[PDB]
């Protein structure tokens, strides 16, 4: 049920930084557990990850600096709703 998304304007993509978005009803301590669970299993595979920020107040989730290789692993984490690659915004 959890899906991945990334910007279509290809030169605006920002690979390596991902916005993990959990389901509506997820609590902040659940979101932090889920985010550290990612680093836990990514460390087992010899990948280093950095949780840059954990969200709460508008949407539940977190922002992780990691390889895209871990995207199958991250999609299967509990509570995960969708993941989106970070991308560039510009002054208008």
């Amino acid at each position: 049920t959890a899906t991945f998304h990334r910007c279509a304007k290809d030169p605006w993509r920002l690979p390596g930084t991902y916005v993990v978005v959990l389901k509506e009803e997820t609590h902040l301590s659940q979101s932090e557990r889920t985010a550290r669970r990612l680093q836990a299993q990514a460390a087992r595979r010899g990948y280093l990850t950095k949780i840059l920020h954990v969200f709460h107040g508008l949407l539940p989730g977190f922002l992780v600096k990691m390889s895209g290789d871990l995207l199958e692993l991250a999609l299967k984490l509990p509570h995960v709703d969708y993941i989106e690659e970070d991308s560039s915004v510009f002054a208008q």
Partner: protein, 471 residues
């Protein structure tokens, strides 16, 4: 000695407790245009760059919003978040963490109505549209720029976001800003246009100097100021209520639609923003196109506190199967059926208090809203095979009348049968609630409302407009 843009948003008749957040570059907060009125939060989330240039974009825009001499809403309080770096560049993640900071600021030290200006754009983002949406259902007014790419604004964020006012730009001759392959964005995701070319504002070169800049964020800046003044005269306004007033008080039918691609001219509203001088409000909503199947439905929907009084459809082809009003999630919704090139669903979304509305689906001298005191606000019509005030007329077709119980509401039905395009408009003071086509000697491909004008397109055709007032 009055800048063209400030005169344009002045109505033809004309006679604080709101805060305005701004997310972009750094700001020269001690510029005499904006000095004292602009608290720099010093929040910062900007990517690494791959000094007077750093704050040029945001200084100008804070000046357009509240500058002392060249601002729209002088005396508006502003707070500044840095999300774009010195090259005008930012990230979606930076903008989420920024929007999140605003909401948590508002929970920790509440104030009056909030107007967040988003003078930025990237490609369509699921996550950024969700955040603007959930911030808007919390009660915060978000105003955004349509985009600078002469494109469909639905392909960009937060321009395409649900529940954000998206603003495109126009210049001093009431035409869309276009510059080669660059220019204002357009389409069903643009709510209105505002002055955005040759806009004079505070220049980050000196504390006293001015510059002229262009952009859909300059257009957005006029509207954030118009909304800031609007929200101080009436702080209780919901966002549905504000957007209806923004549309109502705009200048209508001044833009030269020939500057837009042919297929986007119906989808793009011909509105140029204006302040209120010193009622039944309706706006037309266009659907995300359905598809090329013969079993194909597109859906246009109204705001949560917005009633749906009519529903129609438009097929560029002609081969259409009509439209119908259906309840979904507890809300009236408009759904258009394809035969088939594809179809749009054109909903008429109105703001009516003290009114219960209901759909009555029956064949076509019968009356559909026979309940005494109820008004007929709009008539829909759909069929399966391809071959008198409170009454809907048809041909083999199933009718979907929408009938509201409303005390002050008064409704009259104007018609006009005649060719490519037939029009009939409600008289001044009435609001068009429903627009429908009556068939005849010509196949009709669609009927849609344009402010208070009912427009039916055919290839004998009768336009049928339902107009309502208060008393």
């Amino acid at each position: 000695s009055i800048p063209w843009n400030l005169e344009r948003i002045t109505p033809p008749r004309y006679r604080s407790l709101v805060e305005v957040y701004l997310l972009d570059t750094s700001i020269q907060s001690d510029h005499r245009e904006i000095e004292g009125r602009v608290m720099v939060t010093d929040f910062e989330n900007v990517p690494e760059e791959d000094a007077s240039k750093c704050d040029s974009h945001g200084t100008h825009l804070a000046g357009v919003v509240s500058g002392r001499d060249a601002g729209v809403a002088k005396g508006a309080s502003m707070r500044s978040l840095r999300v774009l770096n010195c090259q005008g560049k930012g990230t979606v993640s930076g903008t989420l963490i920024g929007l999140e900071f605003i909401r948590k600021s508002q929970l920790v030290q509440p104030v009056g109505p909030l107007v967040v200006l988003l003078p930025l754009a990237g490609g369509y983002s699921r996550v950024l549209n969700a955040a603007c949406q959930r911030l808007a259902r919390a009660g915060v007014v978000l105003v955004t720029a349509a985009g600078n790419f002469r494109d469909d604004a639905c392909l960009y964020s937060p321009a395409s976001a649900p529940e954000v006012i998206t603003v495109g730009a126009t210049n001093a001759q009431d035409q869309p800003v276009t510059l080669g392959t660059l220019g204002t964005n357009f389409g069903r995701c643009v709510d209105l246009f505002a002055p955005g070319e040759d806009i004079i504002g505070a220049s980050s070169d000196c504390s006293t100097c001015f510059v002229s800049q262009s952009g859909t964020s300059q257009a957005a800046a006029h509207v954030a100021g118009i909304a800031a003044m609007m929200l101080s005269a009436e702080p209780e306004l919901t966002l549905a209520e504000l957007r209806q007033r923004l549309i109502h008080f705009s200048a209508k039918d001044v833009i030269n639609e020939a500057w837009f691609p042919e297929d986007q001219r119906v989808l793009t509203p011909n509105l140029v923003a204006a302040l209120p001088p010193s009622q039944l409000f309706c706006r037309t909503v266009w659907s995300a196109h359905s598809g090329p199947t013969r079993m194909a439905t597109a859906i246009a929907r109204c705001a949560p506190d917005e009633e749906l009084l009519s529903c129609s459809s438009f097929s560029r082809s002609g081969k259409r199967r009509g439209e119908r009003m259906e309840a979904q999630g507890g809300k009236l919704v408009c759904r258009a059926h394809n035969a088939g090139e594809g179809v749009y669903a054109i909903a008429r979304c109105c703001l009516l208090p003290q009114a219960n509305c209901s759909v009555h689906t029956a064949p076509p001298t019968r009356v559909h809203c026979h309940q005494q005191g109820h008004v007929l606000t709009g008539c829909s019509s759909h069929w399966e095979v391809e071959d008198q005030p409170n009454q809907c007329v048809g041909h083999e077709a199933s009718i979907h009348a929408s009938c509201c119980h409303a005390p002050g509401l008064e409704c009259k039905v104007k018609e006009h049968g005649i060719q490519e395009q037939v029009t009939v408009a409600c008289e001044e003071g009435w609001t068009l609630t429903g627009c429908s086509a009556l068939p005849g000697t010509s196949h009709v491909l669609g009927a849609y409302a344009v402010d208070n004008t009912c427009v039916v397109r055919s290839r004998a055709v009768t336009a049928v407009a339902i107009c309502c007032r208060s008393r």
